[PDB]
Amino acid sequence: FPLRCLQISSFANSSWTRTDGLAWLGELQTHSWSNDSDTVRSLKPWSQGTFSDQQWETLQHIFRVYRSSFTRDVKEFAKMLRLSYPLELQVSAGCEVHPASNNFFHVAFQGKDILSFQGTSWEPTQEAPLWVNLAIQVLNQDKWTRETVQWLLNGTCPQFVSGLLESGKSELKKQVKPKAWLSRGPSPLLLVCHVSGFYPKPVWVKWMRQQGTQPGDILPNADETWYLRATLDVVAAGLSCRVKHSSLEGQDIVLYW
């Protein structure tokens, strides 16, 4: 259950900018960060983990200053470097604890990795324009920011993640049984097995005589359950669809055609 803090900063031009974010603990979204809001919004009753209010507000203040400072620094790099608008930057930062925890802080420009926080400073990723190599020299001057990031990844994060793991331990281990139904798709007669409403995410779906089934992508539902589709291409009887899920206490779902 790693913690993934995502950031989406869009710079249409020098006058229009948006930054939005959210936090993922495993497959669950714990926080939403709207550019139309001063503060980060908690989605779950346990979203605050074990951190106290004074603690949580401290982090809250850091994000305010960081959002404001981040966007102005980008604009100044645009001038100095100098880069053409529109610009789009993405940040992926967080950690996951183990029985030694690991942390990360990557930034992408135009959908490509440009740099990550490594050790105590900023470093260019392998695929990075020469200008990124220059923007680093400027960033590495800011010793304080360099310590805050170091402390946020190595100290703050692992603690906050441990707090979330226990505060929301029951909803993380929660089980939700999926409902299933069959249908006849567009003829290549291809049989379709639908499986929606299951949580957690891991699932098993196959057409039974095991067959050469083609499982689709695990799509999300609005309520945080998942949807899946398994199709089999056969000539137009005894065929079955089997569903194995943790919510199914050994009681596999079985639907005959």
Epitope: D73, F77, V138, K143
Partner: T-cell receptor
Amino acid sequence: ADIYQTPRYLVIGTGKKITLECSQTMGHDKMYWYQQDPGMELHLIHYSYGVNSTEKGDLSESTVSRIRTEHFPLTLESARPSHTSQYLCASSENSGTGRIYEQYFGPGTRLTVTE
Amino acid sequence: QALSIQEGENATMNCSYKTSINNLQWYRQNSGRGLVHLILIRSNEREKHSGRLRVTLDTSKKSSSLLITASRAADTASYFCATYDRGSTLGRLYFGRGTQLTVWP
């Protein structure tokens, strides 16, 4: 040191083209222009990261050029009485040379625009 | 702002900012001249000394004071407080109004 400005003083007619000179022999990539009312709050009107860098500040009708490190000339397309004030030129040390936070100023230009 | 004191007396000037700052610095100006940097205090510092002047920084109340001991005619000038909001060269120096200090005989 140091940084130099000419002219110290100047009185000109409304609507004339003015060019305020600022030079610096310290090798500072970063330079700034300020508009000041006597003893009043300073307003950054232009700044530069280096050669070819010409950025507008939080403040009027004027432009700058940075063809060379040493020179950061300010031009007043037209002159209205509103342009009556002090014009300060400043620079800041390069990273790796000295502390980058302070700004070094010139003598300034006391400009009066009369009707 | 304006402050008038007598030679030998101590002068104290107040300054306050709003946002987060990396460091705070005081300047002085004289008639027909440009600003001269006097002293710099970082956000993680509370007091700094140099010659006859001392700066104090209260990040909590977000304000600073400049003390000049043994005021001397030479101290007569305009004093400005300016904040710097970055730990790099992308920083912005923000100046305050500036108070006229005159040391009389």
